[PDB]
Design a binder for this molecule. Sequence first.
Ligand SMILES: CCCCCCCCCO[C@@H]1O[C@H](CO)[C@@H](O)[C@H](O)[C@H]1O
Ligand SMILES: CCCCCCCCCO[C@@H]1O[C@H](CO)[C@@H](O)[C@H](O)[C@H]1O
Ligand SMILES: CCCCCCCCCO[C@@H]1O[C@H](CO)[C@@H](O)[C@H](O)[C@H]1O
Ligand SMILES: CCCCCCCCCO[C@@H]1O[C@H](CO)[C@@H](O)[C@H](O)[C@H]1O
Ligand SMILES: [Ca+2]
Ligand SMILES: [Ca+2]
Lengths: 199, 222, 199, 210
Amino acid sequence: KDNRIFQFTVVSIIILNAVLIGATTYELDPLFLETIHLLDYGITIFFVIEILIGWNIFDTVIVAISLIPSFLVLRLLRIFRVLRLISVIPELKQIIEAILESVRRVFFVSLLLFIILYIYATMGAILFGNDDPSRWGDLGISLITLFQVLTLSSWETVMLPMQEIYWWSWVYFFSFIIICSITILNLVIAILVDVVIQK
Amino acid sequence: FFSSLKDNRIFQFTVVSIIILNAVLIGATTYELDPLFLETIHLLDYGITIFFVIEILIRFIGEKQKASGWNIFDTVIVAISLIPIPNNSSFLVLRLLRIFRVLRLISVIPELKQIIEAILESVRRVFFVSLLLFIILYIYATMGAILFGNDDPSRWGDLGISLITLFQVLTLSSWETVMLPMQEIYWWSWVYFFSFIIICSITILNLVIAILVDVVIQKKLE
Amino acid sequence: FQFTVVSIIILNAVLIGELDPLFLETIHLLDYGITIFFVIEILIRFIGWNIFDTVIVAISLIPIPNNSSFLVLRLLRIFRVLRLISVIPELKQIIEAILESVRRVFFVSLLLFIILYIYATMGAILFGNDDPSRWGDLGISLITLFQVLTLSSWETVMLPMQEIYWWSWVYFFSFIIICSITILNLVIAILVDVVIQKK
Amino acid sequence: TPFFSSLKDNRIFQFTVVSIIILNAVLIGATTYELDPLFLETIHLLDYGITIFFVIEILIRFIGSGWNIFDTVIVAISLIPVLRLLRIFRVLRLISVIPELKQIIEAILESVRRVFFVSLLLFIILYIYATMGAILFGNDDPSRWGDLGISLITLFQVLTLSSWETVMLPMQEIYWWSWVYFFSFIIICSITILNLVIAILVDVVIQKKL
Ligand SMILES: CCCCCCCCCO[C@@H]1O[C@H](CO)[C@@H](O)[C@H](O)[C@H]1O
Ligand SMILES: CCCCCCCCCO[C@@H]1O[C@H](CO)[C@@H](O)[C@H](O)[C@H]1O
Ligand SMILES: CCCCCCCCCO[C@@H]1O[C@H](CO)[C@@H](O)[C@H](O)[C@H]1O
Ligand SMILES: CCCCCCCCCO[C@@H]1O[C@H](CO)[C@@H](O)[C@H](O)[C@H]1O
Ligand SMILES: [Ca+2]
Ligand SMILES: [Ca+2]
C-alpha cells in the first residue's frame, strides 16, 4: 500500500479532482478530465479494499461516501472525497491524534482566555459603550472586538478612536494584549511539555 | 454524596457550559429568544453555585483545625456569585458582579488553578523583557518624534503617541501605513522601521526561549 | 572575516535606486571578479552542492545585455545574488535544516488544506450570495480563508457576514482556532525532530 | 566603604530607582505648565541624584569587561546637562541598575550570529521574489513593484503578514496565478523562520544541558 511516490501522485490526483469543480472548466482537454476522474475512482477503490481486511469506522464511512459518483449533497461528496486523503497518507493520522491530545489543554487555556475577554468586554462595553457602539455597544460585539484585538488584526482601529476620548486608552488595550499574549505563551509551552512527557 | 461529582468530566463540561451561556446571554440583545430555555439556564446556573456553597461548607466542616489562597478566592467568588444575583441590571455595581459569576469557572476545574500558578510564574521573565522593550520603544520613539515629528504629528506629535505608534508597529498591525508615508520623504525610513522590527522580534524571541528552557529545566531531559 | 564579500555581492545586487561617481563601477567590475575565484575554486577540487555552486557560479560567469534585451538580465541578477550561498557556508546549513523540515511541513500543509476546503465550501455555500467577491466560488473562498488563516485584517471578511448572519463567529472563530492548534502541533513536531539528533 | 558596592543590589531600592528614571523620562517634557512644579522639579533633581550616585558607585568599586565600559560610558553621558539625543542615553542606566537586563542583552547578543545568517537567506528569497514581481506587477501597480527598492519593502510588509491581501488581491484580478506567487512566498519564509526559532533554541540548550 505505502510507497512515497505513488502516495504523492495520489495526493496529486485526489486534490486536482477536488479543485477542478467546476466553473473553471468551461473548456479544457476533456480526455485529461476523464483520466483524472477515472483515476480518482481507482483510488476510492484502492482503500475501499485494503479496508476489507476507531479509525476504521472513519476509513469506511469516508471511502463509502467517496464511492457515490443535488446542491448540498454534491458539496458534501466533494468534502468526503477530499477526506480520503487521510486514509492515504498515514502520517496525517498520527498528526490528527496529536491535535486531539492538544484539545484538552487547549480547552482549558481557552476557558482562561474567555475569562480575560469577558472581563475586558464588560469593562469595555461599560467604558466604550456609547462612544463607539458598533464595537462596544452590546457585550457580544464587545467580545467579537476584543477578539479581533487579541489577534492584533488592525487593532489600532479599535483603540485610537477611544484614545482621543480617554487618555488611559492604551492601558486598557496594551494590558489586554499583553495579558493574552502571556497566557497563549503558557498554552504553547504546556502542550510541548505534555507532548514530551507523553513519550 | 457531594464529595464525588466535582471530579466528573461530563459534569464539569455541562456545568462550565451552563456558566458561560448564563454569563453571555444578556440582556436586550436577547429581547427575543425562547424565554423557557433562558429561564432554565439561569435557574440552573444559580443551582450550580448553590451546589458549590454546599461543597465548600463541607471542606470547611472538614479541616480538623478550621484554619488555599483558593479557599479565600473560592469562597469569595462563590459568596459573591451567590446571593447578589443581577440581570439586564442598570448601573452599575451588579454589572461588575457578572464578572465574579463567570470567575466561578476556576472553582469548577483544577487544571485552571494549576495553569494560573504557571502563568504567575512566567511573570518575572515577562516583566524584565518588558523593561527592555520599553527601553527600545523609547529610543525609537524619540529618534522618531524628532525625525518624523513635524511631518506626521498624527503619530509622532509627542513622545506618548510616538510610543503608541511603535507598539502598533511592534505587533505588526497595518504597520505599512505607519512607515510607507515616511518612505516618500526620508529614504532611510525603511532602515529605521525594519531595524526596530527585527530588534523587537529578536528580543521577544529570546523571551520565549527563556521561559521554554525554564519550564524544561523544571522537568524533563534529566 | 567573510563579511566584506557579502557586502560587495549584496551591494552590487541592490544598486540602481545616482551616487558613487564611478566607485559604483569599482563595485561593478569588482563584484564581477568575485565569481571568477569560484569558477576557479570549484576546479581546484577533485578525485551535490557542486551541482549548485557550478550552475550558479557559471551563470554568474555570463556577461550582460547592453542597450539591449533586458530579457534575461534579471534572471542573471538572481543567479549572481545566489552565489552568496556558495560562499557563505552557514547558509548551506540553514538550507539543509529547511529541507529537513520540508516533509513534516508538506503533511501538515495537506491538513491545513483539508480544513480550508471544508471551510471554503461551508463558507461558499453560506456567504456565496452576500459577498461573491470573497465567497463567489472555491478559488477566492480559499484565498479569503487563507487571508483569515494569516489573521491579516480578517475582521473585514467576517464583519459583513456578522450583520447578516448572527452565528458568523462560530464559523470564523473555529476556523481560526482549529488552524492555530494544528499549526501549533507542527512547530512542536519539528522542534522535537531536531533535538532528536542531540538526545 | 561598602555602602555602594552593596546598594545597587537591593530589590526595593532598584524598583524605586527605575520608577524614578522612568518617570523623569516619560514626563520630560510635553507637560510641565501646571503639574506640581515643585514635584517635577523634584523628579529631575532626584533623577540626577541617581546618576551622581552611580558615578560614586563606580569610582568606589573601581578603587577596590564590557559592562563596566557600557556602565562607565553611560553614567558618563548621563552626567551631562545631534544632542536632543542626550536624554536617550540616560534611559540606558536602567540596564546598569538591573542585573537582569544585563543577562538578557547578553543572551540576545548570542542570538545575533544565527539571526544574521538566516537574514541573509531571507534576503535571498525576498530578492528572488521582489525581482520576479518587479517584472510581473511593475506596469500594473508600480507604487509597490516599480523598482527593487519598493518591491523589497513591499515584500517585507507581505512577509510580516500585515495587511497583505491589499498587495495580493489587486494582482489577483489581473493575473490568476498570483495566489501562487504570494502564497508560496509566505510558506517559504515561514519554513525558514521556524528553522531560525528552533535553531536558536537548540543553540541555547546546547549551551549547557546534555
Ligand atoms: C475564545 C473566546 C471567544 C469569545 C467570542 C464570543 C463572541 C460572542 C458574540 O455573541 C454575539 O454577539 C452579537 C452582537 O450583538 C449578537 O448579534 C449575536 O447574537 C451573538 O451571538
Ligand atoms: C512595551 C511597553 C511600552 C508601553 C508604552 C506606553 C506608552 C504610553 C503613552 O503615553 C500616553 O501618551 C498619550 C499621547 O497623547 C497621552 O495622551 C497619554 O496621557 C499618555 O499616557
Ligand atoms: C494552505 C493551503 C491553501 C492553498 C490555497 C489554494 C488556492 C486556491 C485558489 O484557486 C484560485 O482561485 C482563483 C479565484 O478565481 C482563480 O482565479 C485561480 O485560477 C485559482 O487557482
Ligand atoms: C530582509 C532584508 C530585506 C530588506 C530589503 C531592503 C529594501 C531596500 C529598499 O531601498 C529603498 O528603495 C527605495 C525605492 O527607490 C528608495 O527610495 C530608498 O532610497 C531605498 O532605501
Ligand atoms: Ca498580524
Ligand atoms: Ca548538564
